[PDB]
Each structure stands twice: as C-alpha cells, then as structure tokens.
Amino acid sequence: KVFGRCELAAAMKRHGLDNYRGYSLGNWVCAAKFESNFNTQATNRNTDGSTDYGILQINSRWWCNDGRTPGSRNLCNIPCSALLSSDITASVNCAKKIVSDGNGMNAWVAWRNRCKGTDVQAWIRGCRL
C-alpha cells in the first residue's frame, strides 16, 4: 500500500507515534517519505546481506527474522514480511522499540540526513488529525 501523506500521519497518530520519546508526528512522516516514499512494500538489500523492510525500512540484522541474515537477531519478534503489510501496526510497534534503543531517531540514517534540523511540521501541514 502507498499511503497519502495525511493518511499516514493519521495512521501514525492513532498508533501512538505523536511525540513518542519526544519526536513530533512530522519527524515520523518525514522519515517514512525518505525511507520508503510511503510504500509499505519497500525492500532494500544491504552490503552486509541484511534487508530493510517496509515504510520505516526496519533492518533484519537486529529487528526481524527473514531466515537469510546469518548471526542476526529478531528483537521485535516478528517475521520481516509482517513489516510489508497495509496494516502499519508491526512497523509502528517495532519502531517504538528501535527509537527507545539509546540513539532515538538517529537510528534512521535518512532521518539524520534529510529530516533532523528541518521544519518537519511541514510534513503534517493541512492534515485533519
């Protein structure tokens, strides 16, 4: 599923991301835009052979099981395919564990490089939330 900007903002708000660990909704929408272009089915293979999955490009080296990442962990206790669903619940619940993990949103390289220090509130401007 490819979300609309405001649709995703509404979905992330209903799932508790709004100011989660102090990150305003626009931060998460900005991260989704640059990680996946709001496409739940986005995958990207890493040089180390891990794979990123879903709207927030969550990686198989730590967070989910794809059965092809030797010596990896499954800290969110989910099959990586769950992160590709039109239901963002698995993506949001796993994101809450990642963002709690000491580095906050710096864990998403595209958030640090493209959203941090920008006017992220622009990403939710004109949405009914």
Under DSSP, is residue 51 helix (H, G, I), strand (E, B) or coil? strand
Minimum CB distance to Na ion smaller for 11 or for 64: 64
Tokens 């993506």 locate to: 91
Under DSSP, is residue 2 helix (H, G, I), strand (E, B) or coil? strand
Minimum CB distance to Cl ion smaller for 74 or for 93: 74
Q: Which stretch binds Na ion (CB under 5 A): 17-25, 32-40, 59-67, 98-106?
A: 59-67
Tokens 């794809």 locate to: 66
Answer left, alpha or beta for residue 33, where phi above 0 means left and psi between -120 and 50 means alpha: alpha
Residues 120/27, Cβ–Cβ less than 8 Å: yes
Give yes or no: 87 in active site: no
Residues that bind Cl ion (CB under 5 A): 5, 11, 24-26, 65, 69, 72-74, 79, 87-88, 104, 121
Interaction with Na ion in 101-120: which residues (CB under 5 A)? none
101 is in an annotated binding site: yes
- Selection from 47, 48, 46, 36 nearest residue 83 by Cα: 36
Residue of 7, 18, 35, 48 marked active site: 35
* By the rule CB under 5 A, 69 interacts with Na ion: yes
- Distance separating alpha carbons of residues 104 and 99, to the nearest angstrom: 4
Instruction: Please identify which residue in 51, 57, 60, 91 interacts with Na ion, judged by CB under 5 A.
Output: 60
- Distance separating alpha carbons of residues 3 and 118, to the nearest angstrom: 22
Give yes or no: 7 in active site: no
* By the rule CB under 5 A, 91 interacts with Na ion: no
Question: Could you list the active site residues?
Answer: 35, 52
Extract the annotated binding site. Answer: 101
Q: Which residues are annotated as a binding site for substrate?
A: 101
